[PDB]
Amino acid sequence: YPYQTQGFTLDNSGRRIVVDPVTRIEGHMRCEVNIDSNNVITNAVSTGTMWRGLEVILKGRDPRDAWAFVERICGVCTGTHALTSIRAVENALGIAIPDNANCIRNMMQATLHVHDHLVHFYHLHALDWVDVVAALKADPHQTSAIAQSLSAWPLSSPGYFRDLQNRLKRFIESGQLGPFRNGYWGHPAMKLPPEANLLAVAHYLEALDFQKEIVKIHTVFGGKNPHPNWLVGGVPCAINLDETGAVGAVNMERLNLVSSIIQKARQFCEQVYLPDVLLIASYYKDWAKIGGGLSSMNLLAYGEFPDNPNDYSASNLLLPRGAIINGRFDEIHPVDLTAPDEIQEFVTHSWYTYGNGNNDKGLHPWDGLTEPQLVMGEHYKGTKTFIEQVDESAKYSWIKSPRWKGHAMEVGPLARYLIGYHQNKPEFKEPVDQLLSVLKLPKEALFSTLGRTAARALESVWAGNTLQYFFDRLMRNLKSGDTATANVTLWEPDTWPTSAKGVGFSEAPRGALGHWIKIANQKIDSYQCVVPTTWNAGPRDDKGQIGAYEAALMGTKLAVPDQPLEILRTLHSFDPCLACSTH
Amino acid sequence: PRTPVIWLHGLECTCCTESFIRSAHPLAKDAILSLISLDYDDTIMAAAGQQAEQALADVMREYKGNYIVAVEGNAPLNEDGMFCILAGEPFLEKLKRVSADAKAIIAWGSCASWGCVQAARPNPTKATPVHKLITDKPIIKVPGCPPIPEVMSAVITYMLAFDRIPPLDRLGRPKMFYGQRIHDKCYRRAHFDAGQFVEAWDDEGARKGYCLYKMGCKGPTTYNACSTVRWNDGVSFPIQSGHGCLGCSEDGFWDYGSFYSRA
Numbered sequence: 023y024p025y026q027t028q029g030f031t032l033d034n035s036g037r038r039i040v041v042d043p044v045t046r047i048e049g050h051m052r053c054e055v056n057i058d059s060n061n062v063i064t065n066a067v068s069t070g071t072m073w074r075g076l077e078v079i080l081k082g083r084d085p086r087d088a089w090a091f092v093e094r095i096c097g098v099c100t101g102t103h104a105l106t107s108i109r110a111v112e113n114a115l116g117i118a119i120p121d122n123a124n125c126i127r128n129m130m131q132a133t134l135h136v137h138d139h140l141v142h143f144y145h146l147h148a149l150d151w152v153d154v155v156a157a158l159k160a161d162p163h164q165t166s167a168i169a170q171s172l173s174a175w176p177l178s179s180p181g182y183f184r185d186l187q188n189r190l191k192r193f194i195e196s197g198q199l200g201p202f203r204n205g206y207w208g209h210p211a212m213k214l215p216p217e218a219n220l221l222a223v224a225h226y227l228e229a230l231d232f233q234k235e236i237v238k239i240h241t242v243f244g245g246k247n248p249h250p251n252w253l254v255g256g257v258p259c260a261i262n263l264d265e266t267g268a269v270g271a272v273n274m275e276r277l278n279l280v281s282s283i284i285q286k287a288r289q290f291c292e293q294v295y296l297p298d299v300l301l302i303a304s305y306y307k308d309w310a311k312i313g314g315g316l317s318s319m320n321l322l323a324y325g326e327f328p329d330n331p332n333d334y335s336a337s338n339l340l341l342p343r344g345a346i347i348n349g350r351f352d353e354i355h356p357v358d359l360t361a362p363d364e365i366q367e368f369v370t371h372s373w374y375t376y377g378n379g380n381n382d383k384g385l386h387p388w389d390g391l392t393e394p395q396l397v398m399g400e401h402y403k404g405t406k407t408f409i410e411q412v413d414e415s416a417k418y419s420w421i422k423s424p425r426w427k428g429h430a431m432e433v434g435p436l437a438r439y440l441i442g443y444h445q446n447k448p449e450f451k452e453p454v455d456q457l458l459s460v461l462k463l464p465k466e467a468l469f470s471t472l473g474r475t476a477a478r479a480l481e482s483v484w485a486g487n488t489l490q491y492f493f494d495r496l497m498r499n500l501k502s503g504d505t506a507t508a509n510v511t512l513w514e515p516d517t518w519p520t521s522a523k524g525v526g527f528s529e530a531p532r533g534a535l536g537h538w539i540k541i542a543n544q545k546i547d548s549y550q551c552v553v554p555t556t557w558n559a560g561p562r563d564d565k566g567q568i569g570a571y572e573a574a575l576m577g578t579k580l581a582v583p584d585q586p587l588e589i590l591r592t593l594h595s596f597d598p599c600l601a602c603s604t605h
Numbered sequence: 606p607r608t609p610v611i612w613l614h615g616l617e618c619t620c621c622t623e624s625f626i627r628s629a630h631p632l633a634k635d636a637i638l639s640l641i642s643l644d645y646d647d648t649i650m651a652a653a654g655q656q657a658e659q660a661l662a663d664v665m666r667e668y669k670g671n672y673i674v675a676v677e678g679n680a681p682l683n684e685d686g687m688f689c690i691l692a693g694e695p696f697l698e699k700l701k702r703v704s705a706d707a708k709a710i711i712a713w714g715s716c717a718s719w720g721c722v723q724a725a726r727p728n729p730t731k732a733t734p735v736h737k738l739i740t741d742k743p744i745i746k747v748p749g750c751p752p753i754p755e756v757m758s759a760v761i762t763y764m765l766a767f768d769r770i771p772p773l774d775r776l777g778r779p780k781m782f783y784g785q786r787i788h789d790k791c792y793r794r795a796h797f798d799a800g801q802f803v804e805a806w807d808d809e810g811a812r813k814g815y816c817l818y819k820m821g822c823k824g825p826t827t828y829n830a831c832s833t834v835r836w837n838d839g840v841s842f843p844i845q846s847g848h849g850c851l852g853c854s855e856d857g858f859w860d861y862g863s864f865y866s867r868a
């Protein structure tokens with residue numbers, strides 16, 4: 023059925039390219055696309071290739087333990103799941119956490135945002151835009167000069183570049199490229215000179231060394247990264263600055279370390295990451311017109327970083343909350359997770375069931391159901407052990423299809439950054455505006471793979487500042503004699519309602535995350551997760567309506583079809599995490 | 606020449622790969638460029654799709670019988686292995702094919718070693734660890750969710766330097782790091798021994814560094830180096846930062862009862 027849904031028009035004839043495994047993402051995806059005779063994508067298909075089933079594993083466990091299980095949904099997006107879980111439980115039981123706990127949590131979430139975004143740009147996304155071998159051609163003296171006219175970052179000596187270049191050369195000439203093996207070097211879509219190439223590669227390596235630090239903030243408060251620890255009722259990292267056993271607690275020496283790290287992280291995002299995006303952007307300026315997909319039309323975010331504790335009102339969430347529809351940015355609709363007709367996920371084109379004939383019907387997560395049913399349809403190609411080609415007319419992903427009042431949405435940095443922009447908050451508007459001015463592009467350039475990538479960088483700096491801000495607030499708490507870290511009044515389960523519903527939410531690095539728990543007889547009854555990459559990588563629905571990922575591949579021209587570098591760019595710009603998507 | 610290492614991802618949350626890069630001495634940069642050849646790795650490798658599979662075939666064919674397979678994640682058995690699908694094929698085949706020609710196998714993390722969270726009751730995906738599937742090759746289990754960054758790196762640098770499999774225990778864990786209980790080298794132990802406990806969060810005990818045993822710490826049943834090597838450049842470890850050991854390096858810790866119970 024050559025049919026048309028949302029601006030785009032979909033054709034299932036023409037050549038069919040396959041990308042499996044999709045690398046430089048978390049976990050397992052499979053993309054399939056169709057091209058026309060002219061090498062333009064007439065169809066795009068997003069298949070999640072894994073599942074583990076926490077939604078099921080949590081039945082009948084202690085709601086206090088929940089965060090530790092759901093934490094292990096994902097080690098890249100680390101802690102955003104735990105944080106949501108505790109919020110959800112706390113929400114249900116009515117627990118109020120103290121100010122210092124709300125501070126520390128927000129610091130740890132901000133630390134994630136910074137760290138994740140940085141590791142993602144360099145170590146997942148960059149090699150779509152950076153020719154590593156090309157870098158061997160470069161002149162160190164210019165490379166330095168470029169990197170120095172780009173920023174005040176001190177690691178720029180020509181000697182440092184020569185030496186790294188010679189190291190890189192020996193690596194490549196060794197004939198053991200490791201991660202660079204059979205990479206897309208020389209591709210015609212690679213578009214930056216050897217100087218900007220060597221530069222990026224150096225920063226790639228510097229980032230790989232430095233990222234390891236940023237996460238020590240998690241280490242101090244959470245105990246370890248990845249997979250730090252959290253607590254229903256507050257935080258475990260109890261504070262004791264000045265009295266006798268302070269060595270067994272968060273004290274002045276720990277807080278000093280944390281302070282010290284924050285400053286380094288913001289410095290790295292401010293002087294290294296964001297600039298290199300502006301340099302790299304400038305060469306790929308036409309990628310401002312590729313990969314909008316849903317971004318120009320439909321956006322969603324739940325907000326994040328409550329300033330005052332226990333107020334999850336939009337009024338108090340530093341990161342924007344809201345919902346856009348059909349390019350109506352004048353009308354930024356507010357978001358309600360209790361509402362049952364509001365926030366839903368269909369399985370119509372996904373390998374789960376909802377019972378017979380209710381396959382077309384969509385479910386709010388308090389009623390949601392994760393029961394798997396693997397079955398391929400009529401136009402399927404392969405066996406039970408093999409997949410030559412997926413049948414998208416039927417069920418085709420391990421990812422559920424989430425919708426907001428029946429509209430397919432795009433979530434993530436760009437989404438918040440757009441909502442906050444039209445909410446007219448200058449903490450987002452101005453830095454977005456100044457980015458456009460330097461690249462000499464208009465508002466609409468944001469609606470693209472390039473804009474989506476810019477949005478992420480802008481946030482790492484913002485998130486850095488927020489991190490400092492919540493450290494600054496923790497400190498004014500302690501100066502004023504508030505050192506409390508945990509409410510323990512409902513820590514005992516015999517103190518709980520006999521049954522209770524709850525919603526936990528967060529704005530994770532990749533987008534809008536929610537957990538819809540039900541407690542009953544001191545045990546978990548429901549537990550349902552709708553995670554950001556679920557929204558984005560989600561298959562189609564009852565309506566036949568496509569998701570953010572598929573939509574964004576749609577206009578794309580494949581310079582070389584055998585080597586789909588172009589598809590990877592767009593897909594990587596959404597920061598895919600499929601563990602995260604499927605749970 | 607550098608020892609080639611093929612790093613596979615099965616069912617997993619990618620967390621031991623994230624842990625590995627947190628290594629400080631040696632830097633994961635310095636491992637990648639100078640100690641090993643990280644020849645296939647879903648998470649960071651430039652190549653995708655056919656180009657990615659080709660690159661693997663290249664290194665197996667070429668470095669056959671001499672390469673090390675690192676496995677993070679485990680393999681689901683139910684629905685004929687299609688709860689985890691790499692290049693149109695269940696992960697289980699890909700594992701068997703790659704490890705048949707390998708010199709030795711490192712099982713990173715609790716997923717590959719035991720099952721971890723996907724394998725917690727009622728384990729719908731029938732998630733099954735490496736050593737229950739590959740049984741004709743030597744397996745080093747380096748467990749924990751995740752392992753300690755500098756443990757992972759020290760295991761590799763040891764094997765390269767001494768050209769040996771390190772001494773394993775009954776479970777296949779390098780004794781060097783998994784030989785002693787967290788609790789038998791814990792700093793808060795003095796307090797345990799003198800009955801000084803955190804009884805509830807943020808009590809005088811907690812703020813004084815008291816033993817977390819009553820708050821459900823599983824350090825006394827749990828082998829890892831967390832109390833000694835510690836996490837992230839030895840900055841801290843779960844207990845030091847106020848929370849009891851989860852027992853995350855041991856088999857079945859998810860179904861060992863609650864995390865906040867004494868067991």
Ligand code: NFU
Nearest residue numbers: 099531532555599602
């Ligand atoms: N950000 C982020 Fe994660 Ni691997 C996703 N999707 C989160 O929940």
Ligand code: SF4
Nearest residue numbers: 791794816817822824
């Ligand atoms: S905190 Fe845990 S490992 Fe440390 S002394 Fe107490 S019970 Fe033992």
Ligand code: F3S
Nearest residue numbers: 831843850851852853
């Ligand atoms: S959770 Fe893991 S890191 Fe150590 S203290 Fe317990 S074994």
Ligand SMILES: [Cl-]
Nearest residue numbers: 231232629632
């Ligand atoms: Cl260093």
Ligand SMILES: [Cl-]
Nearest residue numbers: 189192638639
């Ligand atoms: Cl070298």
Ligand SMILES: [Mg+2]
Nearest residue numbers: 422550551552
């Ligand atoms: Mg779900």
